[PDB]
């Protein structure tokens, strides 16, 4: 199975601007990328990339309608500033299970202002003193986190 | 059949069939085939009535299971079969009245709402058409008919009443029942709904009936009379009536047994008028002289080994002028000496062949030609001098002295060890570690006793004899009596103990006898005790030095005969070792039961807390002597070896019958106060086996001595 | 070879004897024909083998092309000969060739041994990983017991074992699969897949499977554990005067609980037998009906014995009274009614046994011998096993003996019932009274001097090994071995579940079962609505979801039609009991709307369909305007963790699509995927010739026969010409459904009794 | 390297499933070690 097969199954061989969500899960990728998603995409709301072996974020269509994106179980470790230049309209961010070394990796999210929830589970950065407080004062725009900002609501 | 009914049918269907049979006063047990038929009928009716329902419009259709539709879910078929006769009749009448149909004169099986008809379901082993016509004639057209047969054919009054699936399923069930019955062989026994009212037929003919009539106990004149008498007459104390008249001269004669009643068994051995028991064992045991040659360890053919062993001792190999010490009674000195010379020449010949080069002198040396010629029965009938040989009973002998000396000598350590055993896998469990320790402690003791060497010599000789007999059938052969002996330093000496000529072993059966003549090297001059060697013709073929002390060297020659049975048991004589260990194992285990730790080092050698275990082993001047654990193990092993070598019918009859006295003595020592019925009978049974077997006579002697010891020690 | 087969057949038929025998003996009679061998068995195998090993060529080689791999004489050593043979018609050979083959020659495949000889390698694995301990040299008390020598993958009776073996490794000759392949479908498919890819002779595999399935049981002296794993090593573990510590490298409690629940459910109703058997054969334990472990173990708890009697199975004929297992030894007891005053002062009319009798008595780990006369216990011999078991044995034997002292020892009252609320016979009422108050008849029973002897020693009322014992009771420091001749004699079953002998005597009563509740260690999934309206909400949800899952095909098919009949199923009525009344209607409306949207504007999604279907049993209550209410969190009775998540999953229900698995009430189940493809993968076991029924005779209109592979090509409802068993040409029709004879019989009985009641 | 761990089930905190493992470990301690553990509350006084 490949990203192309998932794209064909979800789109069912139709125009790219017909679905506002994608499910790219359990898909092998060339050197850890997210190919199979052409830049021609114009409308997209939800994303899902799990067990894709994504190692970096360097290929992504420019978008202005996406609000949620899901990355998990990946060895990606690099600056995410490119998201601002690609789609500065993210509201739900999920990095659960990813591999991030230190706090500097999550710095480039400051320039994004629409993010309200960020998820980081069993991450090497999560095991630090005052990581919760340090992240909060580092990303003032954030309104939610792993789930315990002040209360518990569901996405 | 009932087991098949229970297995292949649900308890509910069985209950319904039993109820139906009870309504008709028919016993299900007495007519299992009828019960099976009724169960199959109920099952097929239920199978037909299932899964079929009617829609609101009234068209037949299928309804799913476990999925109700409110309450009604009206089924297509209402089963009438299986209800009580009154209830079934009332239901049929109610349906007929409700749907305005004629009430059938005969009770129906099912009712179809769609067709609004009463359906009869039938089964048969014959053609469906025949049964269908019979049922139609009996019942008429008032009821629809559906008959299925076990051969995958059917007759239906209407072909639309049942779909393909229903007929296929009923036929599959019938075929499965038929196949299962055939596998259980009940198919042929099974009898259908027309023959099940007959039952099995098995009537006695004329000759067998007459034999039964004349084979009735006394007082009867016909087996019908005996049958009626047994079925009707009731005995209510016939046993006591018979006992009340039976003579009072019959009884077990119960007499309490005390120590005084027990007396020595076989007093005739003590009597000196009888001859001393001779040495009848196959090979010499405590007199074997081992022509020992040191070898690197290579295993070679016995012929080459004997050749080399004689080559080392040139004086004995080339000896050609014998000095007859004694020619026993019948054997000829010339025959035996020439045969032995041919043996030596064949062994020392350059050719690897180990068969006698004469083939004609041996024929008379071994006495093969000294045999009777069989004639036909007619001449024997006509001739008057052809009588029947009187049975030859064994001689009644006395206690010898060589048996005791051999018993002592074979049960002593020797620097030479031969018994070796294959390795086993590594021991990882504690239990096998304990077993290995015990095994080592045992072999360290048994290996160095001379009885082990004798046992190995016997086993090797019999193995070689069997191999030669199987390979060579009708040619005389030469067989060295070979053994392998490792000394404490690890030098693997090969020992030649003599030679043996094997005769013609061409025998289809096993009990057939094959003759072999044994020549044995020895260092014992028989003149020291001539009573031990009345069966042996011997020479004096020279002398040898073991370490500087010159000792003579004689050759004991004797003709003997064996058979495939004893020949095999020769290679199974190793089991003596097992018999030696088992009991001692038990002994040790008993000790371990007393105190928790393991004692195998304590019983053998002792420790700082427990003294070494000592048994009572021998005696001297009337004073019993103790003996170490190893010595007792040696004594038991030698006892087993002798039980083999001197084994025959007499030994079995002696042991299996003196065990009675052994157990009686054991009971007496525990003060159980054993009673006996006929003591002299047991004593006679035992003592009718002490005739000429040396081990039997010595066993009797030791039994008498030990019984005397027990009698003297019973005072406490 | 088939041409060689036909040529050999023709040559054999050329003789008239072959023609007459072949045309005379049916296929069934073949067995007899095979058994007419010479039977000139060797009298002494040892001598024969010894002689043969020394012969030039004792080995009897089968004719073939293998010999060409090896010369008739290698390195100057003779190996094989070209002389003809009469005994086997092959060639002759010597062990030299065998050793050379072990040295050189063709190299085979090593895969087959990984799985084919699974039992042997499992034995080796259990040995290797076992942990040894100390050795206790003290004496060991051992009891003779009927033990299973070797562990079994799935214990089954011999006939079922043979049928399963044939269905596994003999694809042909599989006519009309019985009611045994569906039970063992998982075993069938597992062994089929494992053994595929081999080349071993089929008979070897058949014998190995027989060893792996058919049970082997024997009388052995055992002390301690008794599972087959320990019995394998019993030769090393045990010992007359030595013991070793060994630890080799469940369903029982669940079946006990299920049988007890079935008994309690069926007793309260009339005609308990039919209802009990319906529930028993409609029950399942996680992969199989209850006739997969009941038929495995020998005997068991009284409830299991009663259920087995209700079903078709063999039960040990020991007499169960309360917990006591009694085996008569001698004497005949006349059961005569008598009026006896009880110690409480009341007078009861009950049956008493006139005459002397003796019984071997067992209870848990306690064994003994009881000798009793009418209205009196005479003697009792026991071994020290356990205080609880010994007390139970003493009290139960006391009550059973009907000793006048036991009656005079009553002090309270006897008006008890069971969990079903029924009045029992005075015997069982007294049993319960005395067990509840053990120190009632013990005090007034009376004491007897200690059994002065070498080993016989007494026991006091407190069960401690203390002297001044009870009158009659004796404890011997020996081993009592009892319960011989387990004939499994014929036993009848009454409607009320109480068993009886071949005669009218009663062996097991419906009330022998003890009213003790436990927790099923496994998913006890039934198939009838009547059963599961007892337990907790979680159990109800789990059982409803299992019912939905089992018959997924029917529900999925009914979904396409789009009719409300699909939703009005009885299976969901119990579910209605665990949904709040004030809000169930809103759930039903919301789920109905969601499922209508699913049918209209999207495609199949099994997980959400299963999640949302059950809530629609109750009628809907739409919004005032008419639109359906919207929810995302369905609350259930008990609150807290008893709630369903509409979106992804919850504690009771969570389906993961990455691996396509279903977790219900903390239990993972494999939904391979969706689609009739996954349906057929579920059907990947079953049995060869399971989708075809028999109808008609040969019917040569189809010409020659067709194989199973070509059989599958035919569309449903066609007619095909096939061979059944060893030949027997027949005509078959492909099935359009899956059948269940037990369900049909149960429904027929239900309709019959409904008719009987309505007429009554 | 010294723990035996299973997986029992999954909890839900904010509608999200989080697994639960059961770390099973054998250990050996004496009465004096129990006393030491009991006195382990002295860390409060130590830090103060």
UniProtKB/Swiss-Prot annotation, chain A:
Q: Which residues form the LRRCT domain?
A: 123-155
Biological processes, Gene Ontology terms: intracellular signal transduction; nucleocytoplasmic transport; regulation of apoptotic process
| Location, primary (coarse class) | nucleus
Known tissue expression: Expressed in all tissues tested. Highly expressed in kidney and skeletal muscle, moderate levels of expression in brain, placenta and pancreas, and weakly expressed in lung. Found in all regions of the brain examined (amygdala, caudate nucleus, corpus callosum, hippocampus and thalamus), with highest levels in amygdala.
Per the record, residues carrying Phosphoserine are: 17
Carrying Phosphothreonine, the residues are 15
Could you state what the record's PTM comment says about this protein? Phosphorylated on serine residues, at least in part by casein kinase 2/CK2. The N-terminus is blocked.
Does Chaperone appear among the keywords? no
| One GO MF term attached to the UniProt entry | histone binding
**Sequence ranges of Basic and acidic residues compositional bias:** 147-155
Where is this protein localized, as stated in its record? Nucleus; Cytoplasm; Endoplasmic reticulum
User: Which keywords does UniProt give here?
Assistant: Cytoplasm, Endoplasmic reticulum, Host-virus interaction, Leucine-rich repeat, Nucleus, Phosphoprotein, Repeat, Repressor, Transcription, Transcription regulation
Residue ranges of the LRR repeats are 18-38, 43-64, 65-87, 89-110
Top-level taxon of origin = Eukaryota
State the similarity comment: Belongs to the ANP32 family.
Q: What does the UniProt function comment say about this protein?
A: Multifunctional protein that is involved in the regulation of many processes including tumor suppression, apoptosis, cell cycle progression or transcription. Promotes apoptosis by favouring the activation of caspase-9/CASP9 and allowing apoptosome formation. In addition, plays a role in the modulation of histone acetylation and transcription as part of the INHAT (inhibitor of histone acetyltransferases) complex. Inhibits the histone-acetyltranferase activity of EP300/CREBBP (CREB-binding protein) and EP300/CREBBP-associated factor by histone masking. (Microbial infection) Plays an essential role in influenza A, B and C viral genome replication. Mechanistically, mediates the assembly of the viral replicase asymmetric dimers composed of PB1, PB2 and PA via its N-terminal region. Also plays an essential role in foamy virus mRNA export from the nucleus.
According to the record's subunit comment, the protein's assembly and interactions are:
Component of the SET complex, composed of at least ANP32A, APEX1, HMGB2, NME1, SET and TREX1. Directly interacts with SET. Interacts with ATXN1/SCA1. Interacts with MAP1B. Interacts with ELAVL1. Part of the INHAT (inhibitor of histone acetyltransferases) complex. Interacts with E4F1.
Q: Please identify the protein, giving its name as recorded.
A: Acidic leucine-rich nuclear phosphoprotein 32 family member A
């Amino acid at each position: 199975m490949e990203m192309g097969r998932r794209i064909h199954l979800e789109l069912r061989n139709r125009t790219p601007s017909d679905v506002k969500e994608l499910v790219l899960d359990n898909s092998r990728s060339n050197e850890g990328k997210l190919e199979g998603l052409t830049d021609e995409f114009e409308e997209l709301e939800f994303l899902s990339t799990i067990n894709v072996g994504l190692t970096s974020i360097a290929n992504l269509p420019k978008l202005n309608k996406l609000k949620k994106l899901e990355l998990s179980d990946n060895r990606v470790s690099g600056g995410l500033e490119v998201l601002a230049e690609k789609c500065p309209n993210l509201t739900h961010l999920n990095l659960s299970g990813n591999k991030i070394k230190d706090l500097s990796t999550i710095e480039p999210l400051k320039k994004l202002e629409n993010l309200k929830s960020l998820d980081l589970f069993n991450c090497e950065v999560t095991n630090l003193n005052d990581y919760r407080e340090n992240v909060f004062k580092l990303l003032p725009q954030l309104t939610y986190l792993d789930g315990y900002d002040r209360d518990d609501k569901e996405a | 059949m009932d087991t098949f009914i229970t297995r292949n049918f649900q308890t509910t269907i069985i209950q319904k069939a039993k109820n139906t049979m009870a309504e008709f006063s028919e016993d299900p047990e007495l007519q299992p085939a009828m019960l099976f038929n009724i169960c199959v009928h109920l099952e097929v009716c239920y199978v037909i009535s299932d899964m079929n329902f009617l829609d609101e419009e009234g068209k037949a259709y299928t309804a799913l299971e476990g999925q109700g539709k409110e309450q009604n879910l009206r089924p297509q078929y209402e089963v009438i079969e299986g209800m009580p006769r009154t209830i079934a009749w009332m239901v049929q009448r109610s349906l007929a009245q409700e749907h305005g149909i004629e009430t059938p004169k005969y009770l129906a099986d099912l009712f179809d709402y769609k067709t609004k008809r009463f359906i009869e379901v039938g089964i048969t082993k014959g053609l469906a058409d025949d049964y269908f016509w019979k049922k139609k004639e009996k019942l008429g057209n008032s009821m629809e008919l559906m008959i299925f047969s076990y051969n995958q054919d059917y007759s239906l009054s209407n072909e639309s009443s049942l779909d393909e699936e229903g007929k296929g399923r009923v036929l599959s069930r019938l075929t499965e029942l038929q196949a299962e019955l055939s596998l259980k062989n009940l198919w042929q026994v099974l009898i259908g709904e027309e023959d099940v009212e007959k039952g099995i037929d098995f009537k006695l003919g004329q000759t067998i009936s007459r034999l039964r009539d004349i084979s009735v106990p006394a007082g009867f004149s016909n087996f019908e009379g005996m049958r009626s008498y047994i079925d009707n007459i009731d005995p209510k104390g016939a046993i006591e009536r018979n006992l009340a008249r039976m003579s009072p001269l019959v009884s077990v004669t119960p007499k309490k047994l005390t120590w005084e009643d027990l007396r020595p068994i076989g007093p005739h051995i003590y009597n000196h008028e009888l001859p001393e028991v001779p040495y009848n064992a196959f090979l010499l045991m405590s007199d074997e002289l081992g022509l020992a040659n040191m070898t690197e360890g290579k295993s070679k053919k016995p012929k080459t080994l004997a050749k080399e062993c004689l080559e080392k001792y040139s004086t004995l190999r080339d000896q050609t002028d014998p000095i007859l010490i004694m020619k026993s009674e019948k054997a000829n000195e010339n025959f035996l000496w020439k045969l032995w010379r041919d043996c030596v020449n064949t062994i020392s010949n350059e050719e690897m062949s180990n068969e006698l080069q004469k083939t004609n002198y041996a024929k008379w040396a071994t006495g093969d030609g000294l045999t009777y010629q069989k004639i036909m029965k007619e001449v024997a009938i006509d001739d008057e001098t052809m009588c029947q040989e009187e049975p030859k009973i064994p001689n009644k002998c006395r206690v010898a002295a060589w048996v005791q000396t051999e018993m002592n000598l074979l049960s002593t350590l020797t620097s030479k060890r031969a018994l070796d055993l294959p390795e086993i896998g590594p021991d990882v469990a504690p239990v096998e570690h304990v077993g290995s320790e015990r095994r080592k402690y045992f072999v360290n003791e048994i290996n160095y006793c001379k009885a082990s060497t004798v046992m190995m010599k016997y086993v090797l000789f019999h193995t070689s004899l069997l191999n030669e007999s199987n390979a060579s059938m009708g040619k005389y052969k030469v067989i060295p009596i070979t053994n392998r002996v490792v000394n404490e330093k690890g030098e693997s000496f090969d020992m030649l103990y003599g030679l043996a000529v094997k005769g013609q072993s061409h025998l289809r059966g096993d009990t057939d006898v094959v003759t072999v003549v044994t020549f044995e090297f020895s260092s014992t001059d028989p003149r020291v005790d001539s009573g031990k060697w009345p069966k042996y013709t011997v020479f004096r073929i020279g002398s040898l030095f073991v370490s500087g002390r010159e000792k003579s060297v004689y050759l004991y020659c004797r003709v003997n005969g064996t058979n495939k049975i004893q020949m095999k048991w020769g290679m199974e004589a190793r089991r003596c070792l097992l018999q030696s260990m088992q009991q001692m194992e038990a002994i040790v285990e008993q000790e371990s039961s007393i105190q928790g730790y393991d004692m195998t080092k304590a019983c053998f050698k002792g420790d700082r807390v427990n003294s070494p275990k000592t048994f009572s082993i021998g005696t001297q001047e009337g004073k019993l002597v103790k003996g170490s654990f190893g010595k007792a193990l040696r004594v038991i092993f030698t006892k087993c070896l002798m039980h083999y070598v001197f084994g025959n019918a007499q030994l079995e009859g002696f042991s299996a019958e003196s065990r009675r006295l052994l157990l009686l003595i054991q009971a007496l020592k525990d003060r159980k106060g054993p009673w006996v019925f006929d003591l002299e009978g047991m004593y006679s049974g035992i003592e009718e086996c002490i005739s000429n077997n040396p081990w039997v006579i010595q066993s009797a002697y030791w039994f008498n001595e030990w019984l005397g010891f027990e009698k003297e020690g019973s005072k406490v | 070879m088939t041409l060689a087969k036909i040529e050999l057949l023709k040559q054999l038929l050329r003789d008239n004897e072959a023609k007459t025998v072949l045309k005379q003996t049916t296929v069934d009679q073949y067995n007899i024909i095979r058994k007419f061998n010479t039977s000139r068995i060797e009298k002494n195998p040892s001598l024969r083998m010894k002689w043969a090993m020394c012969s030039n060529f004792p080995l009897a080689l089968t004719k073939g092309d293998m010999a060409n791999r090896i010369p008739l004489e290698y390195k100057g050593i003779q190996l094989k000969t070209n002389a003809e043979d009469i005994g086997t018609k092959g060639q002759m050979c010597s062990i030299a060739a065998v050793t050379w083959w072990n040295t050189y020659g063709p190299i085979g495949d090593t895969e087959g041994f990984e799985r084919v000889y699974e039992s042997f390698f499992l034995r080796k694995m259990r040995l290797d990983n076992a942990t040894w301990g100390r050795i206790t040299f003290g004496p060991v008390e051992r009891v003779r017991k009927r033990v299973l020598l070797n562990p079994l993958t799935k214990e089954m009776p011999p006939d079922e074992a043979s049928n399963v073996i044939m269905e596994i490794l003999f694809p042909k000759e599989a006519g009309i699969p019985r009611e045994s392949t569906w039970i063992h479908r998982e075993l069938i498919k597992e062994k089929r897949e494992k053994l595929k890819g081999t080349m071993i002779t089929p008979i070897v595999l058949a014998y190995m499977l027989e060893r792996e399935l058919v049970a082997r049981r024997r009388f052995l002296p055992v002390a301690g554990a008794t599972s087959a794993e320990f019995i394998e090593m019993l030769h090393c573990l045990q010992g007359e005067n030595w013991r070793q510590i060994y630890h080799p490298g469940s369903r029982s409690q669940s079946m006990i609980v299920a049988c007890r629940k079935i008994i309690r459910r069926s007793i309260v109703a009339s005609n308990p037998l039919e209802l009990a058997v319906e529930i028993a054969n409609k029950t399942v334990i996680d992969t199989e009906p209850l006739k997969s472990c009941l038929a495995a173990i020998d005997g068991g708890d009284v409830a299991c014995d009663i259920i087995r009697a209700a079903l078709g199975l063999k039960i040990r004929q020991r007499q169960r009274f309360g917990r006591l297992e009694l085996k008569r030894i001698s004497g005949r007891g006349f059961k005569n009614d008598e009026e006896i005053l009880i110690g409480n002062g009341t007078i009861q009319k009950i049956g008493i046994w006139d005459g002397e009798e003796e019984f071997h008595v067992r209870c848990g780990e306690c064994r003994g011998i009881l000798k009793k006369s009418k209205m009196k216990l005479e003697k009792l011999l026991i071994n020290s096993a356990k205080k609880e078991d010994m007390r139970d044995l003493i009290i139960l034997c006391m009550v059973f003996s009907q000793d006048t002292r036991m009656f005079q020892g009553v002090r309270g009252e006897i008006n008890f019932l069971n969990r079903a609320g029924q009045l029992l016979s005075p015997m069982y009422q007294l049993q319960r009274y005395f067990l509840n108050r053990s120190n009632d008849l013990f005090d007034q029973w009376g004491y007897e001097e200690s059994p002065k002897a070498s080993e016989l020693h007494g026991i006091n009322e407190s069960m401690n090994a203390s002297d001044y014992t009870l009158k009659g009771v004796v404890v011997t420091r020996n081993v009592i071995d009892d319960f011989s001749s387990t004939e499994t004699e014929k036993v009848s079953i009454t409607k009320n579940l109480s068993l009886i002998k071949r005669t009218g005597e009663v062996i097991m009563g419906a009330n022998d079962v003890s009213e003790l509740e436990s927790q099923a260690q496994l998913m006890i999934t039934y198939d009838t609505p009547k059963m599961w309206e007892m337990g907790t909400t979680k159990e109800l949800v789990q059982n409803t979801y299992q019912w939905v899952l089992k018959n997924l095909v029917t529900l999925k098919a009914q979904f396409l039609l789009g009719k409300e009949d699909m939703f009005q199923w009885d299976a969901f009525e119990a579910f209605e009991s665990i949904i709040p009344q004030k809000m169930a209607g809103q759930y039903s409306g919301f789920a109905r709307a969601v499922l209508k949207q699913m049918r209209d504007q999207e495609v199949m999604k099994t997980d959400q369909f299963i999640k949302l279907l059950p809530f629609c049993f109750s009628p809907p209550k739409l919004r005032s305007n008419g639109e359906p209410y919207q929810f995302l969190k369905l609350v259930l009775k008990g609150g807290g963790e008893n709630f369903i998540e509409v979106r992804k999953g919850s504690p009771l229900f969570s389906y993961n699509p990455q691996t396509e698995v279903l977790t219900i009430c903390g239990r993972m189940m494999s939904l391979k995927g969706k689609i009739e493809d996954e349906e057929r993968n579920r059907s990947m076991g079953n049995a060869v010739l399971a989708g075809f029924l028999v109808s008609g005779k040969y019917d040569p209109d189809l010409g020659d026969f067709k194989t199973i592979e070509e059989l599958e090509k035919l569309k449903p409802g066609e007619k095909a010409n096939i061979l059944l068993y060893q030949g027997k040409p027949v005509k078959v029709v492909k099935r359009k459904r899956y059948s269940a004879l037990s369900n049909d019989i149960s429904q027929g009985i239900k309709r019959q009794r409904m008719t009987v009641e309505s007429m009554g």
